[PDB]
Design a protein around this nucleic acid. Structure first.
Ligand SMILES: [K+]
Ligand SMILES: [K+]
Ligand SMILES: [K+]
Ligand SMILES: [Mg+2]
Ligand SMILES: [Mg+2]
Ligand SMILES: [Mg+2]
Ligand SMILES: [Mg+2]
Ligand SMILES: [Mg+2]
Ligand SMILES: [Mg+2]
Ligand SMILES: [Mg+2]
Ligand SMILES: [Mg+2]
Ligand SMILES: [Zn+2]
Lengths: 15, 225, 132, 343, 103, 77, 36
RNA sequence: AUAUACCGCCAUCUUCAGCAAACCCUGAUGAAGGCUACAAAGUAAGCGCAAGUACCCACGUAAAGACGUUAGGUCAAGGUGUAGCCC
């Protein structure tokens, strides 16, 4: 825990 | 612009009057005496926090001071009327089964709510799970009997305080009023006492709801013109 | 305790598909078969060969469409036709799915010497039957 | 054999050995642990050792308006691709090796003093961003069970506060330590105390109380004195908003007794206005930095008494020998009044 | 030359905000009670120790009698006393320079 | 181009809204957004005639941001 | 940034209730939700 | 080599009915505990049982049978972690 902090548009016919 | 006037003429105006709903005309020390409100339990059953409200013991039977009851009853009815006026949810609670039917009908008649049945663990402290995240809890709980059927305090008294809900309660001489917001020392056993309580609360609640509509209607008619 | 093909209860966070959620005793009761052919009918031959082919096609498609399969394959045989029906995701570009369809149909047709067709149904996400 | 191969999920489930009698009771400990790695992460469909360029799969389908043909990268051009993938693999490993280190608590291996952040937002769009959470105790509790023998659970004590007088604490219990953290901190914000503060920096008066066997003596202090108190009291005081106070904890040093004993004492402190109302007299503060100037701090809201408070020539108040021994200079301790970091 | 400018810059405000430069510093030591003296110096033959003090860790902080806004951070606003070195964690070398600049 | 019965006008405002979204989420959004003058005037007029005045008032800012001349008809409505 | 590809609406929404269904499923084919 | 690193498939209580996330409350917010039907603090998704299905019925027999118990069995079904061999 202390060592490490743990680690849109949709359109038709996109080109 | 118009909301501040609304809350001032409707919500804040009733709070500037000592008896806005005239609940003092509903009862008298004589009317309470005829309903046997002064009759308490035997001295051996007395709760020590009820001693301030006891007039004395008549042959080992405690007598409730109706002069104090009258002042406490005035406050309880006044609070109840204001909460009905503000459209609060009022829930009646009692476990005495002799009066379950009477209390359930009184709630339906006044447009309020009654819980006279077995009280399941967490109705108030876990309401969102039992009813849903958007459940609205009561704004006032009125106990006509504060003890359960094993002569212990009704669990909703403690849980109402946990949820910061004001409580009105009839407290007989063997009851604990410490956590009841507006206690009313009085007989909780005799049918004449219990019937009287139901009439007073029913009338106070019904009167406050009618007053709210009268004011609102007047405030609208005057607003247009 | 029986283990075979049983997704075991967890904390309620594990999504399982309809097929994964049904143990073997529900086969033919609540779930059907993932391959249909005539080799296992009475008086029919070549069940061993159909079984090896099916095991291969499942591995071939798993590695040919890596990360794309959202459910087990449904294998259908009619005559000498082989139809492969797969539920896939909508992450790969359509061009890559058309490439792999043309590639897989051709390679499998020459491998097993039969006309092979691949039918793709795309879903936005793995269809969840329940959370075990 | 091609047919004896398994999927990655089967291979990792076996190799990791997370299910088994080793992982049931933690019978196996893991200073060296097999860690799951996603080996399809940086892999591109169509890319192989031979370096073939498949039009439409790993290279564009059309180039200059014409369909590309099958091609293969040169031996030199393919080594660069392979080398670039190895470096990208160490870079990705370096990105996972770079984890931001969090501040420690009262000690490097202690949970006490560590912040857990604000409590989670409630179901009805309720938020607690103004509140901070601090851990006070994390304990491993071991329950003997009828069939499963000794089982390990976690009991956590956490405190919450907004720094403006509203603070509370709650116990959390769960098999996992992070589920206990959630329970305690979320529960604590529903059991908040309000703590009165003198001038929003200290307590109103000296508080000496006992809760069970834990004694806590707190002293009102002026600005700049800081929090010279048991480390847990320091943590709790920062959540409340107390800046200047001395506290001495004697007897049993039980974190729970100390926490609820501290909140009980801080919640029962009489303010200056409450004292003025109770006695119907002015409360007048005399400060040596302001000389003889009388500073009225509180006046009764109701009528003001006309009869002076009786002046008992000698008060019958009980004194602390530690306070008297100090005032006289007879209290000599090598550990008192030591230089410490700002708290 | 103009050390008071650093405290008015954006770099300073981003690193320290409105807190004192020593707010986030913590001494590394064994035990609960720290040693009663801080380290003699954080710069030893032009080499900096692993955990330099609030003054030594920022080379743009200049202890000078004109940079009064920095000096105020090491004097108590309520009592006017200069914080002892363990209070802020400054090394003994920089604490002497701060005490002389303050005077 | 012309006004229509309320039922049609409401439908034209739902389409103009979807067109507005297309202008806002163009793939050239990486570069500056090109909002023709006629497009802005028409989309605004269609909102007014539909009763979505709140949306029309908001769009007036886009005439100043992109420096597009407002049409006479839009100002009168 | 290129927009993610949006699946078209199922062509069932364009089918009339009085169409020639044999033209949709002329030969044996697997079940297609978008076409049924 | 290691089933005392495992997946996979199982034995066993089971000729059981319980396990249980998420909440809530009691014990002073101690380890702990949470039921009374003329009911007094518990609500509970999910899993199992049950239901359903198979065989000749709704019966019976199969099948099913959770969590956990025995570091139970199997590295020699296959796969595989670690260690070891490579004339
Ligand atoms: K095993
Ligand atoms: K093996
Ligand atoms: K092995
Ligand atoms: Mg009674
Ligand atoms: Mg068996
Ligand atoms: Mg350490
Ligand atoms: Mg074993
Ligand atoms: Mg049966
Ligand atoms: Mg059996
Ligand atoms: Mg069954
Ligand atoms: Mg063994
Ligand atoms: Zn230094």
């Amino acid at each position: 825990y202390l060592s490490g902090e743990e680690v849109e548009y949709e359109c038709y016919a996109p080109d | 612009e118009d909301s501040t006037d609304f809350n001032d003429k409707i919500l804040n105006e009733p709070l500037k009057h000592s008896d806005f709903f005239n609940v003092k005309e509903l009862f008298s020390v004589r009317s309470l005496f005829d309903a046997r409100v002064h009759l308490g339990h035997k001295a051996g059953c007395r709760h020590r926090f009820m001693e301030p409200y006891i007039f004395g013991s008549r042959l080992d039977h405690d007598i409730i001071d109706l002069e104090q009851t009258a002042t406490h009853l005035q406050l309880a009815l006044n609070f109840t009327a204001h909460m009905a006026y503000r459209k609060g949810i009022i829930l009646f609670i009692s476990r005495n089964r002799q009066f379950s039917y009477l209390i359930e009908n009184m709630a339906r008649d006044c447009g309020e709510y009654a819980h006279t049945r077995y009280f399941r663990g967490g109705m108030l402290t876990n309401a969102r799970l039992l009813f849903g995240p958007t459940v609205r809890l009561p704004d006032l709980i009125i106990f006509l009997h504060t003890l359960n059927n094993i002569f212990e305090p009704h669990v909703a008294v403690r849980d109402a305080a946990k949820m910061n809900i004001p409580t009105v309660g009839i407290v007989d001489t063997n009851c604990n009023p410490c956590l009841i917001t507006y206690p009313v020392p009085g007989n909780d056993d005799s049918p004449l006492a219990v019937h009287l309580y139901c009439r007073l609360f029913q009338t106070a609640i019904t009167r406050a709801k009618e007053k709210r509509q009268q004011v609102e209607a007047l405030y609208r008619l005057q607003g247009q013109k | 305790k029986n283990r075979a093909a049983r997704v075991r209860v967890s904390k309620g966070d594990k999504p399982v598909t309809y097929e994964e959620a049904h143990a073997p005793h529900y086969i033919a009761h609540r779930k059907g078969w993932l391959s249909l052919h005539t080799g296992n009918l009475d008086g029919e031959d070549h069940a061993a060969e159909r079984t090896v082919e099916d095991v291969f096609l499942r591995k071939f498609m798993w590695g040919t469409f890596p990360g794309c399969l959202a459910d087990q394959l449904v294998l259908k045989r009619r005559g000498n036709q082989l139809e492969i029906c797969a539920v896939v995701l909508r992450q790969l570009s359509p061009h890559k799915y058309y490439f792999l369809v043309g590639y897989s149909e051709t390679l499998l047709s020459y491998f097993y010497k039969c006309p092979v067709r691949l039918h793709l149904q795309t879903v936005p996400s793995k269809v969840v039957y329940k959370y075990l | 054999s091609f047919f004896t191969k398994l999927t990655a999920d089967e291979l990792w489930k076996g190799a990791l050995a997370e299910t088994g009698a080793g992982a049931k009771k933690g019978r196996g400990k893991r200073t060296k642990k097999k860690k799951r790695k996603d080996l399809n992460r940086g892999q591109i469909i169509g890319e192989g050792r031979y370096g073939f360029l498949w039009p439409g799969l790993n290279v564009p389908l059309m180039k200059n308006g014409a369909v590309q043909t099958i091609a293969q990268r040169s031996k030199e051009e393919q080594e660069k691709v392979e080398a670039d993938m190895i470096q990208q693999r160490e870079e990705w490993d370096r990105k996972k090796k770079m984890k931001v280190k969090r501040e420690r608590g009262w000690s490097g291996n202690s949970w006490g003093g560590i912040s857990l952040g604000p409590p989670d937002p409630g179901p009805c769009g309720e938020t607690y961003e103004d509140f901070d959470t601090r851990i006070l105790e994390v304990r491993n509790v071991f329950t003997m069970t009828a069939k499963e023998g000794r089982k390990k659970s976690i009991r956590v004590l956490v405190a919450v506060g907004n720094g403006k007088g509203a603070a509370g604490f709650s116990i959390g219990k769960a098999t996992d330590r992070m589920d206990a953290f959630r329970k305690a901190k979320n529960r604590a914000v529903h059991h908040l105390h309000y703590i009165e503060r003198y001038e929003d920096h200290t307590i109103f008066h000296d508080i000496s109380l006992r809760f069970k066997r834990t004694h806590i003596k707190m002293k009102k202090q002026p600005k700049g004195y800081g929090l010279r108190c048991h480390r847990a009291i320091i943590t709790i005081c920062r959540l409340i908003g107390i800046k200047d106070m001395y506290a001495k904890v004697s007897g049993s040093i039980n974190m729970l007794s100390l926490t609820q004993g501290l909140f009980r004492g801080l919640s029962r402190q009489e303010t200056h206005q409450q004292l003025a109302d109770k006695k119907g007299l002015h409360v007048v503060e005399i400060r040596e930095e302001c000389g003889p100037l009388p500073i009225v701090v509180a006046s009764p809201r109701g009528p003001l008494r006309k009869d002076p408070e009786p002046e008992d020539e000698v008060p019958d108040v009980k004194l602390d020998w530690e306070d008297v021994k100090t005032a006289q200079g007879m209290k000599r301790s090598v550990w008192s009044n030591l230089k410490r970091a700002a708290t | 030359d103009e050390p008071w400018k650093y405290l008015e810059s954006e770099e300073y405000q981003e690193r320290y905000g409105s807190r004192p430069v020593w707010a986030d510093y913590r001494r590394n030591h064994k035990g609960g009670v720290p040693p009663q003296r801080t380290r003699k110096t954080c710069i030893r033959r032009n080499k900096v120790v692993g955990n330099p003090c609030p003054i030594c860790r920022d080379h743009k902080l200049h202890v000078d009698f004109r940079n009064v806004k920095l000096l105020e951070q090491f004097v108590c606003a309520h009592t006017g006393i200069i914080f002892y070195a363990p209070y802020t964690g400054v090394c003994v070398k920089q604490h002497k320079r701060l005490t002389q600049a303050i005077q | 181009r012309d006004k229509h019965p309320p039922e049609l006008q409401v439908a034209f405002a739902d389409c103009a809204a979807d067109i507005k979204s297309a202008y806002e989420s163009q793939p050239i959004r990486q570069t500056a957004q090109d909002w023709p003058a006629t497009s802005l005037n028409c989309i605004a007029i269609l909102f007014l005639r539909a009763g979505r005045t709140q949306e029309a008032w908001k769009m007036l800012g886009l005439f100043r941001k992109h420096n597009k001349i407002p049409r006479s008809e839009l100002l009168n409505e | 940034r290129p927009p993610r590809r949006k699946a078209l609406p199922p062509r069932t929404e364009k089918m009339a209730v009085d169409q020639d269904w044999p033209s949709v499923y002329p030969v044996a084919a697997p079940f297609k939700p978008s076409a049924v």
